[PDB]
Write a protein that binds this ligand. Structure first.
Ligand SMILES: *C(=O)[C@@H]([C@@H]1NC(C(=O)O)=C(S[C@@H]2CN[C@H](C(=O)Nc3cccc(C(=O)O)c3)C2)[C@@H]1C)[C@@H](C)O
Ligand SMILES: *C(=O)[C@@H]([C@@H]1NC(C(=O)O)=C(S[C@@H]2CN[C@H](C(=O)Nc3cccc(C(=O)O)c3)C2)[C@@H]1C)[C@@H](C)O
Lengths: 505, 505
């Protein structure tokens, strides 16, 4: 028999995955089993056996009887409906005292919460010959050789199930309303980098296997996005340190001509000669292009690299994507300033944003708290807060934070739909075009956007960062353009802050 | 967006896997798409569009109309039935000139032979957002970083498609006839170790994904078996080399009393005082136990290790199982002499068996011929024949081969069902009990056996080794006990020798 596979735990000791015993229904149907026996050891009345067994398994009495009639066979099973039976299903069948009926014990992998952080936890699959389980995605795969066994090691995550529930419920709401092609939300402790909650859509159910394999990629570590205007914060931070951003100095908005192409602010005309601070509140593309000119393209590329972009964060997930900084020509450089051409992972965005709230120190995000064996007490691994680098000074960080405050809370804001009543919110919005997966160019349509928000609360001294992103709503794409991910960000952030005992304004 | 993923080829350059273009059906249903256009650019007649589209995709006209009626939606797709469409499917729909209907090109992973060496080749899965493909089993996974791109590298196998066809057809026959729980066949070049064909049952279809994930374990490299009497050849080889086996010296058959358990020959009574050669032809358990006593338990354990058992063969498959030599106490030792308690992988058996046909040198089995890039011409890897060790002398090998010949061809043989008309065959049979995966005994029942044959032909100087094994037939289990895997070995071996131009007599 196999050693017990280790358990996966959340940060408070709740089981996310474990081994349980279930039962498989077996019917001996050959008369030769009762040749030299006092009481029958096979099924005598196929019809009565079918009726009574039908009251415990999800199979019609006609089908049980048909399967019971198979010839040249000593015993039969009943397919998917006959296995994974509970301990109460077992007791019910055995009271029936049906001749030739028995239940075989089987080990299964149990996920108590069903569809729940599924793309992070993953799923283990069973080799029916030996009962051996092997992880095929996420934590179950990454740590397969520790979890596997006389008893395997346990893996404790930084996930908080109470916060995970808020994220799962918000994402179900987004799917219902917007039916987007892709969707993710992540909650990170703003001061440690711990991943407190993470989910995506579409996803699978590790308990049932439903939809497993339809999308291999974990959004947090393996999928890449052109982030859009959330990426302007790192352009802004660079501009501040170089002395190029002055919040009150005016600049020419409108458009710029780059290698013969017209790139303009989102309203085509701009706002004339406006202060640089208002440019960022308005999410002016020409501000960012102007700032790049002042800093210099060469210096700006290094800045984005110093913020950790273009390379893996070296987390503990398999196949972490590196992204890439689009810098080949001046058109790629200029569109990178507002988050197109350059591709990122959500975990890179969390790593970079954390600098604004830790005196300029980027925090390496992390989700594995411990790998340890509960019998021997050996601890193999313990997660830690770690500074991934310090690209900016304390003063630049605070000056970035002042413009993020204004993005949500200026009189001239266009992001008031992210406000939560009783909590002070800040962050940056994004409404990015999405590259055509085959045809080249960008995906066309009425509002073909990846909409996102990189937010934190309470502002200035936040408890958590919440990053949510929604790609290509197929339903209500007008409203997705207007409201972004506000219908996910608000319940996630509000419920998280209350559960973390932060006081309402 | 994505580089072309490299191809998997067979040994003669036939494609086993490649990237193809397929098509996705898209319907624009919003009237606003035809606001400034003379001819309609959206679906005007839902009922006629559905009826006509119902003729190219597998969807009933009511459902096409129901999807076309979705509200707050600009474009709609048709789920799995609307994608993976062929180039002819495209031409047929475009001839209809339906307003608002179009086809998008999509890259798919194409397996030209469908269900074919599936657990060796594996399957790549697509991330719908980016089109990025990732191997999830077998070669597609093991070599994912080479196959992935630019243009990815090709992987050439030693598989011969012509011989693989013989193996797929033979295993289809065994399933229909025997409905076993597990089944495998492998064909290896007797002089190089090249794996010329390999398959198992149950398995999946890499092209459609049907049944993928139901069994993760590759039988050749990852599954373990109590081999049974096929393992006696290595006990025999040790005894020959140690001077303990003399073919004409008689021994007492019947039973031996081992730690209070009576272990007897398969006919319970034995054959009296018979020569050791006849003992082996009969698959005598007491012969192997007597020989083990003569050699010594300590010396015999080392012998099985020099035959490569108990450790991985260090092949190129992921997670190769090591097996284990069952040696805790004398009852484990003595049952190991006839292939119970000890567990092995089929690849270890091919490796050990090859010693008898290469002057005592074990050949390390291998299935990867080349990893190379067709653009740059860089070769990253080239497979080759490799000696895993020389545990026996040339003389011992010859004396083993003489007994394997007799097993099939003695007048007193019980393996005459493995004879092929016109070809001289040799090998060893096995009829082994199977450990219950849960609980602590053997699978009970009328014939609860893993039956197998380790055969080679022509005898003395074989071209290929054919190892087939069938675990726990649920249909015709009496016949499986009597005939073993003969109904698989014979068409596989006969068709292969003919394809290799070996002369029939
Ligand atoms: C960055 O992603 C992108 C530019 N930034 C943003 C952003 O979301 O911050 C946009 S979206 C643009 C600026 N905000 C405007 C807005 O919310 N207007 C609005 C509100 C409600 C209704 C309507 C309507 O009636 O359509 C409009 C719109 C901007 C594209 C970079 C890459 O350009
Ligand atoms: C090894 O696996 C096992 C012993 N070896 C083998 C073997 O397959 O070589 C067996 S099977 C045993 C010997 N061959 C006998 C047989 O085929 N008898 C037979 C043939 C046709 C009809 C009948 C019938 O009328 O029932 C019987 C059976 C043997 C168990 C070790 C582990 O013991």
């Amino acid at each position: 028999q196999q050693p017990e596979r280790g358990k996966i735990y959340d940060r408070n000791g709740k089981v996310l995955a474990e081994d349980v015993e279930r039962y498989k229904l077996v019917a001996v149907i050959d008369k030769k089993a009762s040749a030299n026996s006092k009481k029958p050891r096979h099924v005598v009345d196929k019809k009565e056996t079918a009726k009574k067994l039908s009251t415990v398994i999800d199979m019609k009495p006609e089908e049980i009887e048909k399967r019971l009639s198979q010839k040249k066979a000593f015993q039969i099973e009943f397919g998917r409906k006959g296995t994974n039976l509970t301990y109460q299903d077992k007791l019910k069948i055995e009271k029936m005292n049906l001749p030739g009926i028995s239940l075989l014990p089987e080990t299964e992998r149990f996920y108590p919460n069903g569809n729940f952080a599924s793309h992070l936890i993953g799923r283990a699959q069973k080799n029916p010959d030996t009962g051996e389980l092997k992880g095929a995605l996420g934590v179950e795969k990454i740590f397969d050789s520790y979890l596997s066994g006389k008893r395997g090691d346990d893996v404790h995550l930084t996930i908080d199930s109470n916060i995970q529930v808020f994220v799962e419920e918000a994402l179900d709401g987004m799917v219902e309303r917007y039916q987007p092609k892709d969707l993710f939300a992540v909650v990170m402790d703003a001061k440690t980098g711990e991943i407190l909650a993470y989910s995506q859509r579409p996803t699978f159910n590790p308990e049932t296997g439903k939809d497993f394999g339809k999308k291999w990629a974990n959004d947090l570590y393996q999928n890449t996005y052109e982030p859009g205007s959330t990426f302007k914060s790192y352009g802004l931070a660079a501009a501040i340190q170089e002395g190029a951003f002055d919040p009150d100095k005016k600049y020419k908005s409108g458009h710029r001509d780059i290698m013969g192409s017209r790139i303009s602010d989102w309203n085509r005309v701009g706002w004339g000669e406006i202060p640089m601070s208002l440019g960022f509140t308005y999410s002016s593309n020409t501000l960012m292009m102007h700032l790049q000119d002042l800093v210099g393209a060469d210096k700006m590329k290094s800045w984005y690299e110093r913020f950790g972009f273009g390379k893996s964060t070296k987390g503990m997930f398999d196949g972490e994507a590196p992204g890439q900084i689009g810098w080949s020509n001046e058109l790629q450089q200029k569109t990178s300033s507002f988050g197109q051409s350059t591709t990122v992972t959500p975990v890179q965005m969390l790593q970079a944003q954390s600098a604004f709230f830790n005196d300029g120190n980027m925090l390496k995000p992390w989700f594995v708290n411990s790998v340890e064996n509960p019998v021997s007490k050996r601890q193999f691994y313990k997660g830690q807060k770690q500074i991934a680098g310090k690209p900016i000074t304390k003063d630049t960080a605070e000056k970035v934070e002042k413009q993020l405050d204004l993005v949500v809370n200026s009189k001239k804001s266009h992001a008031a739909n992210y406000r939560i009543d009783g909590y002070e919110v800040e962050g940056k919005t994004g409404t990015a075009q999405v590259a055509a997966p085959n045809g080249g160019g960008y995906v066309k349509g009425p509002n073909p956007y990846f909409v996102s928000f990189m937010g934190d609360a309470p502002k200035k001294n936040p408890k958590v960062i919440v990053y949510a992103g929604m790609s290509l709503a197929q339903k209500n794409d007008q409203e997705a353009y207007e409201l972004g991910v506000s219908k996910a960000f608000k319940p996630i952030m509000e419920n998280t802050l209350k559960y973390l005992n932060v006081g309402k304004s």
